Every structure is written in C-alpha cells, then in structure tokens.
Design a protein around this nucleic acid. Structure first.
Ligand code: MG
Ligand code: MG
Ligand code: MG
Ligand code: MG
Ligand code: MG
Ligand code: MG
Ligand code: MG
Ligand code: MG
Ligand code: MG
Ligand code: MG
Ligand code: MG
Ligand code: MG
Ligand code: MG
Lengths: 223, 124, 53, 225, 63, 128
RNA sequence: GCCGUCGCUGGCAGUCGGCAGAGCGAGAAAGAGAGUGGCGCGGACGCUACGCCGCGACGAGUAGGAGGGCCGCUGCGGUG
RNA sequence: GGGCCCGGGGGGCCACGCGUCCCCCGCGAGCGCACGGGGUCGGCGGCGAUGUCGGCUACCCACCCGACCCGUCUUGAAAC
C-alpha cells in the first residue's frame, strides 16, 4: 500500500477539473503504472462443547412487513451537510438578534460552530447575553466590527457544549448555570470587553436595543 | 384438478365472504383467510394449516397426505407443537422446506404461527 | 380424466364391507357450473303456480 | 464445475463494458467533429460576405433550409383547409412547435396557415435548447423523454443517428434523414411566451405575431422554451 | 385544447370469451401464456379465436 | 395507546363537503341525496360559475388511501367471534367493526377475542 | 400531484432454493447451449390470472346509444 | 478557408504494450467522492389533567368573491 496523494486535478468549477483525461494521464504517470491480472463460536460446557449461533433467528414475525425503499443519492445526514455563512458575518461583527428572549439586543459574533449555528456573546455585562448559540437567518448583521483576531476562544465551546440537557418532572425542574459556564464567560469576556471599550460609544451602543419606530423602514436604512 | 376446482369456487363457496370491499375465505388450512388460488385449503393436493391447540397452548400444524385425496377422514395429519417461540417456528420451517411441501407457504405458515403464539401470551 | 379407482362399500357399522365398485364414468364427466345454473334456472320455474289480479 | 461458467459470465460482462466504452468514444468524437463543422459553416458565411464587399459586389446567402413553426391560435372556429394543414404539421395544440424543412411544397402549406402560426429560421442555439430541454422521442407511439442516448439509437440508429448530437446535427443541417429524425421527435410542447405577445391576430410585419418573422423566431423561442 | 376526435379511441374487439365455460377459460389461461411468452404468431391466432363468438367459429365439415 | 397500523400515510381528500342536490335547500320534498340535474335550462347542469357543484370522477380519492379510516386502518364489519378471526393475518391494516344488531352479551366476547388477536375494534365501548 | 378512460390487443405461471445458484432493458437476428477429438440449514411481498403490475396519451356535452355499479327496493332457490 | 487544421526545414490531445507483416514515408485489483435511474437528516425547540390539546365535515353566526326558479315546449325562458 502507498500513502494517499492529494488530487492532481484542481477544481476549475464544481464537477469540472482543470486538466483533461490525457493531461491527467501523464500527471499520474499511468504510462508506467500499468497493472495486469463467522456465524458460530464454539464454547465448552460442563456433551463437552456446544456450537453457538452468534445471531439467532427471530422469535416473532409480524403479520405484515413493509418493502425496502429504492436507493437514492445526495441525501446526506445533517452532520455531513456543508455549512454556509453570509459574507456580512465576520468574527467581531455586531449582530441584532431577532427572536427569543434576547430579541433586539446587539451582540458580538465570535465564530460559526460545526453545526452551522453562530456563537455570540453580549458580552454578558453589557446586555446580559451570555455565550449563546444563535441561528444566522434570525440575526441582522450590522456593518460595525471590532477586531477580535487576538481573542482565544476556548476549544471546548462546541455544539455539544451548548446543547440543552433534558430535565425531568413527575414538581418543576429549574435550569442552573454550571460553574464552568461562568468561568468560561469571564475568560472570553475579559478579552472582548477591553476591545469594545476601545471604540468610543460602542459599549453604550451594545447596551441599547434595536426597534423600528415611526417612519423607519428596514429596506431603506443601512445596518 | 386444483385449477378446475378453483373455477367452480372462486366466486361461489360457503366459505367466501365479500364485505367492505374485501374478500376472505373461512375454510380450514387457508393460512391467510384469503380468497386465492394459492392459499385455498381445499383444492390442492398438498396444503398446510396452522391452528391453536385445543387448549390455549401451542399450535397444530396440519399437512395433507398424498394418498387419500378422496377420503376426508384420513386426509389430514395433525401435529401439536408446544415449544418455545423460536423452536416452534424452526419446526414449521423445517416441516416445509426440508420436505419441499408447499415451499411457497413457508413464511405465511411462519407468520401465522407467530400470531397464534403471541395471542397466547397474557393480555396486558 | 381416465382414472376410475375402486370405491369402498361401507357396512351399516361404518366399516369397509370389503366389496368394491369401480367408480362409474359419470363421476368423471365435465363439471359445468354454467350449464347447471342454466338448467336449474329454467326448470325451477316449471312448478310455479300462476298469479294475476 | 461452476468456476468455468463464472469466467464465461464475467467475460461476457467485460465485453459489454468494452463495447459500451468504445461507443462513448464514438459519440464524444462525433460531437468534436460537429463543433468544427458548425464553426466552419459560421465562419464560411462571414468570409463569403467579406470577399464580396471587398470587390464591391453583393454576396446573397442561401435561403434557409429549416423553419421552426409555432401555432399561435386556439382550436375554436378553424376553417377546414387550415385545420387539415395544421394537422399535417402536427400542430394540433396552441404553442406546439415543430421543425419544417423548407421547399416549394412546404412553404406554400405555411402560407395557408399564416394567421395560425409564427415561424422563422432557428439558429444553432435554438435547435440545441429546444431538443435538450423539451425534446421527446416517439418510441412505440409513446412520448418518451430523451433522457438516455439508447433511446435515440434504437430508433434512428439505422440512419447512424445514435446520440443527441447526431439528432441535433440531422435537424440543424437538414440531413438526408431529416424526415425520419424529425418525425421521431414529438411536437414540442412550449409554454406561454413570458413577457407577452404583440398581437396574435395580425402579421409580424403589421406589429403582430402571425407569419414569417425570419431569424426573429429565436427571440420567441427563448421566451417560450 | 387539442384538436382530435375521440369516436374511434376505443377499439371494439374481444379481449376474452363472452362464454362463462370454465373449460374454455382454462384453455384461454393456457394460450394466454403461450401467446405472451412465445414468439409464435400461431399461438396468438388461436388465442384470438378462443375469444370468438359462435358465429365467428363456424363448424368445419369432415369433407 | 391504541394499536397502530403498519403505515400511516397522509390522507388527502380532494373534497370534504358533501354534494348536496340542486334546489334541495328550497324544499323539504327534495332530499339532499345527489340527483344529476337533467332539465334543459338547468344552470347547475351547465356548470355555470357560482352554482352548486356536480360530482365527477376527478374527485376520486387516491387508491392508496381510499376507504382508509383516520386511524390508518380499514374497517370490516363482524357479527361474531368466528368472522373476527379472518382478520388474524391482516391485523395491521384492517380493523373490526361490530354490527349494530349484536347483543351486549356477544359484544363482550368479540371485544375480548379481538384484544387477544391484536385486532383493533372501532366500537369497543358500546352497549356496556 | 391525484382520479378515471383509452392505447401499448404491454409485463407476471420464474415463488424454476442446499435434488440451490438468483441475470435476459438492451443501439443494431439467433444459445448465460451439450458434450467428442487434436462451521451455519437460511433467503421479505406476491398470483381473488374476472388477479396483480408498468409506460404514454387523453377527459365539454343536449337528443340518443352503450358499459359498470361491493347502488337501492320486494319476493324465490342455496349459503352464512 | 479546406485537406484526421496537406508536406518540408507556451498550451491542450477520449495518443500512450509489443513482436511484427505492412499501407504510407477480450475478465487487474481495491478504496473513495459525486450536478449521476423522483428526499432525506445518522438535525433541533416549545407545551400539556379542569383548562387546555386535536376534530375535514356537520350546528349557529360573520365577512370577501360568485350567484335570476325549477320542469317544459322552444332558434331563443329569470321572463310580462
Ligand atoms: Mg373565435
Ligand atoms: Mg412576469
Ligand atoms: Mg377572427
Ligand atoms: Mg383537456
Ligand atoms: Mg366527446
Ligand atoms: Mg363511438
Ligand atoms: Mg337550452
Ligand atoms: Mg364526457
Ligand atoms: Mg356580487
Ligand atoms: Mg311546455
Ligand atoms: Mg316562439
Ligand atoms: Mg326554464
Ligand atoms: Mg319579458
């Protein structure tokens, strides 16, 4: 066996390579790369030994069964889908949340998680929005950007980090802010907050909520 | 012959039920109660029947012998199986495949046996 | 359709008497449900009494 | 012994693949050839005109051999002679389309149905898009989309038309078997013109839509294909 | 709307025997299979004449 | 917690209103049972806009969900325990309806047996 | 997309299983031919053939014709 | 311009074994991605036992658009 080699045909456009068949034929040196033509486990027992079937026939059969589906292609699971991000959402961009209890608040975009959801912070001390996931379709990307290129976001802050844990009821069960989250909030905030205060009137801008008022029309105004 | 006897009874039989846009057959040795040439339990030389035992324990597998085709009293051989669920199905599968006795009724016989045994569990 | 086996004669006690009769040929005749229904249909009208106002 | 039969089974599959692979090369190279041919036809017309303009003369190009015909009127109140001619063109429905190779016999049929059709000369792009998006074959008298090349080859193969490119070349250049390749195609079902019409009830030269609009049919084909 | 007539769409021809005879229909089952699964046009002709009516099946004399 | 069918496809009805007969709102003598209007001037027969509609084979239901109950099953009237057992091998597609004229005594046995065979009953709680 | 009609007078008896070997939709007649010399015991559904399945086109209607009604009413032979 | 874009002295080719005779001068293997014979997620969230959830249709009400009374003779009927 040999180590995999990166494709020698760069992509020109999706589905079309840069090089033709004969061009690739030479690049791959195919002129010299020519080539020519358990179900049971035995166990001892206290007979002497028994041949044991690893998988047993069903003990039941429903009266009816559905047939097998026809085969398709291109229907991937969610985890294998490509994630897209609006070009207007770069790290350090200020976004306006449009849904949930934090609607109208202006928050700082940190990064896009593997699931495709965005990660944002208020920061908490400015508008009481913590490290929280938000969906890009439900945010307005303003044109205001702070430079958070030097901010080290903890690497454990992943989709699994922010996934909700189920709470059971038989009265009521209350969510609790784990001490780890508080520690993570301070670590990230301590780096973003000084950079927000570098821009005049920006911390006050982040404290203030977005709302439409008389005569103000979203299609007319720049964000 | 079976085919000739199916032309007589396919739409004229005391065992024929037509109702609610559905058709069934109530004769013995019909594994699916289906008005069908394949599943009819009277017109073929060889037939398979699965019924519950006289007591609600086990199944009775009925096989039609080859010889007495015109002698209804000795025509059918009954066998009671009262093993565990998986062992009962294996015997039915072997009684059909190994003997090559209507191999086209193998899963219908196995599905009917699983439905009788399941009905013999305690009702929740 | 040319098989005429022997048919057992049974005794009044429900056992084979040992005597046999060859199956009469009439039991191998064509079975025609449509001829029977035609004949049963038209013969069953022959015992009717007339009615009229 | 089964192993000997399996090799026979495999060697039959290999041969079919090797024949299938050689056929792909044939259609690949026919298209490469047609591309060159179309370019020479396009360039040759320009060169003939340029050399006539140089000498102070006029180069008069050959009258078109191909017309595309669209029925622009409904089916209510059609006179018997128009009704028969529209049936022979296979335009039995409004906005149906067909290619019609031009000659004295056919040009005079198109004159009888002048109020009921918009026609004109399609360019190479019109023949491409018409047959790719909306091309259906008449196979065993059924309307089958030409989704695979074998569909063309089984019916027109005897005329050496074995791929969509061979079909487009027979139609566009009006080849020896235009009649067969063109009857093979089901009449094109075109949509309502997007962007509207001018006046379907009068001639194109009157500011309407009926009649011969020459190369201007291509604009109409873009909006209906 | 499509300009076409519909008076001739339905073809008048027997797809089966009008007879309810069960022996004739067993022969039709037989020759339906043979006509379908063999390339023999003779089977198709016989299958067609099994559907035919009494007057379309004249008796053939010995002479 | 009721027995479920093998599949539960969405049931699509082209029309859910009934086809009420023409002029049956105007008289009591005209019942709402559909009658095809056949008068010469009848504007319903001519399909004038805004008038009572007429049934036609276009309203036909999808063959896959036709005669299907909202639960996903198809009913089958039964009069006794013996008729019930025909549904033993199709208990995942066909349910049981007990006929109206079966006495309260016998309904207990039919309902009792149906539970054992995993057959669903549409009207098990009647005549208690 | 769904319903029906018509057409293909289309396809399916091959459910040919451990007495096994799964194919015959494919551009272009005719054989997945036969030979003679040089561990496991397993493999969904189907087929009321008056059944089931596929593909394409089509659908106005008085007078009038024809088909199908597991439409409805009363009584008779059978059967349940 | 046409002649597999004839013959001689930086960029793409659906050229790429060979012994030759010479015109001319019949089965490699694997692995993987996919604009590939019609949709999937191997993606998630909220709410729920006395006032709430679902209920096409049906009972009543409202609104917007549509809307003349049937049968009949009749070229023509909502017809004064
Ligand atoms: Mg007009
Ligand atoms: Mg527009
Ligand atoms: Mg006019
Ligand atoms: Mg139409
Ligand atoms: Mg008509
Ligand atoms: Mg007619
Ligand atoms: Mg009138
Ligand atoms: Mg009609
Ligand atoms: Mg109004
Ligand atoms: Mg009158
Ligand atoms: Mg008058
Ligand atoms: Mg009137
Ligand atoms: Mg008046």
């Amino acid at each position: 066996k040999g180590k995999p080699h990166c494709s020698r045909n760069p992509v020109l456009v999706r589905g079309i390579g840069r090089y033709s068949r004969s061009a690739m034929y030479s690049r791959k040196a195919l002129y010299k790369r020519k080539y020519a033509a358990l179900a049971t486990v035995t166990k001892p027992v206290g007979g002497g030994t028994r041949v044991v079937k690893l998988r047993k026939m069903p003990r039941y059969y429903p009266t009816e069964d559905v047939p097998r589906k026809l085969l398709s292609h291109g229907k991937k699971p969610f985890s294998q889908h490509v994630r897209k991000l609006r070009a207007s959402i770069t790290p350090g961009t200020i976004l306006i949340i449009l849904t949930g209890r934090h609607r109208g608040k202006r928050v700082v975009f940190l990064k896009q998680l593997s699931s495709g959801l965005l990660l944002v912070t208020g920061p908490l001390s400015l508008n009481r929005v913590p490290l929280r996931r938000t969906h890009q379709k439900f945010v307005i990307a303003t044109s205001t950007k702070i430079d958070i290129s030097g901010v080290k976001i903890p690497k454990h802050l992943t989709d699994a980090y922010f996934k909700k844990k189920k709470l059971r009821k038989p009265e009521k069960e209350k969510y609790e802010i784990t001490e780890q989250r508080k520690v993570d909030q301070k670590a990230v905030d301590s780096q973003i907050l000084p950079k927000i205060k570098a821009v005049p009137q920006l911390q006050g801008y982040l404290r203030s909520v977005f709302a439409l008022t008389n005569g103000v029309y979203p299609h007319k105004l720049v964000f | 012959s079976a085919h000739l006897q199916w032309m007589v009874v396919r739409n004229c039989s005391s065992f024929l039920i037509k109702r609610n846009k559905q058709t069934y057959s109530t004769e013995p040795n019909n594994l699916k109660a289906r008005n069908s040439f394949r599943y009819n339990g009277l017109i073929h030389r060889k037939t398979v029947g699965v019924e519950p035992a006289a007591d609600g324990k086990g199944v009775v597998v009925v096989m039609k012998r080859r010889s007495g085709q015109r002698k209804p009293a000795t025509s059918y051989v009954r066998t009671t199986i009262n093993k565990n669920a998986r062992a009962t199905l294996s015997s039915i599968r072997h009684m059909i495949r190994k003997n090559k006795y209507h191999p086209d009724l193998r899963m219908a016989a196995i599905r009917r046996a699983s439905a009788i045994l399941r009905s013999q569990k305690p009702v929740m | 359709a040319c098989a005429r086996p022997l048919i057992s004669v049974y005794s009044e006690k429900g056992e084979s008497s040992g005597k046999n009769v060859t199956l009469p040929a009439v039991f191998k005749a064509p079975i025609r449900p449509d001829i029977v229904n035609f004949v049963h249909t038209n013969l069953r009208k022959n015992n009717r009494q007339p009615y009229a106002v | 012994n089964f192993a000997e039969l399996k090799i026979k089974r495999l060697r039959k599959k290999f041969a079919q693949k090797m024949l299938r692979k050689a056929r792909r090369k044939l259609i690949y190279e026919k298209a490469k050839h047609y591309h060159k041919e179309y370019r020479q036809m396009y360039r040759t017309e320009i060169r003939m005109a340029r050399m006539a303009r140089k000498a102070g003369n006029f180069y008069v190009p050959a009258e078109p051999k191909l017309a595309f015909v669209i029925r622009i009127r409904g089916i209510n109140g059609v006179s018997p002679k128009v009704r028969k001619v529209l049936q022979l063109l296979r335009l039995r429905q409004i906005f149906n389309g067909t290619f019609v190779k031009l000659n004295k016999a056919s040009i005079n049929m198109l004159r009888i149905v002048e109020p009921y059709i918009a026609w004109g000369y399609p360019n190479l792009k019109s023949v491409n898009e018409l047959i790719y998006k909306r091309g259906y074959g008449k196979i065993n008298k059924k309307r089958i989309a030409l989704t695979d090349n074998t569909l063309i080859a089984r019916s027109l193969g005897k005329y050496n038309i074995i791929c969509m490119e061979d079909l487009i070349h027979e139609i566009y250049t009006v080849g020896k078997h235009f009649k067969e390749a063109n009857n093979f195609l089901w009449p094109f079902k075109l949509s309502s013109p997007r962007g509207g019409m001018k006046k379907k009830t009068t001639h194109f030269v009157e500011g309407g839509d009926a009649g011969n609009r020459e190369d201007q049919i291509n604009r109409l084909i873009r909006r209906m294909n | 709307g499509v300009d076409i007539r519909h008076n001739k769409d339905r073809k008048v021809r027997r797809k089966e025997p009008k007879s309810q005879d069960i022996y004739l229909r067993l022969l039709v089952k037989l020759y339906r299979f043979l006509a379908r699964r063999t390339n023999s046009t003779f089977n198709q002709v016989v299958l067609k004449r099994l559907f035919m009516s009494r007057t379309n099946r004249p008796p053939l004399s010995l002479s | 917690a009721a027995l479920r069918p093998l599949v539960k496809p969405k049931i699509v009805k082209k029309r859910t209103k009934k086809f009420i007969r023409h002029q049956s709102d105007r008289y009591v003598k005209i019942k709402r049972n559909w009658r095809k209007p056949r008068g010469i001037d009848n504007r319903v027969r001519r399909r004038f806009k805004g008038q009572i509609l007429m049934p036609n084979i276009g309203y036909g239901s999808n063959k896959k969900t036709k005669h299907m109950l909202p639960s996903g099953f198809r009913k089958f009237l039964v009069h006794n325990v013996k008729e019930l057992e025909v549904l033993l091998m199709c208990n995942k597609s066909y349910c049981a309806e007990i006929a109206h004229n079966v006495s309260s005594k016998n309904r207990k046995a039919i309902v009792e047996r149906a539970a054992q065979l995993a057959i669903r009953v549409t009207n098990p709680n009647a005549r208690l």
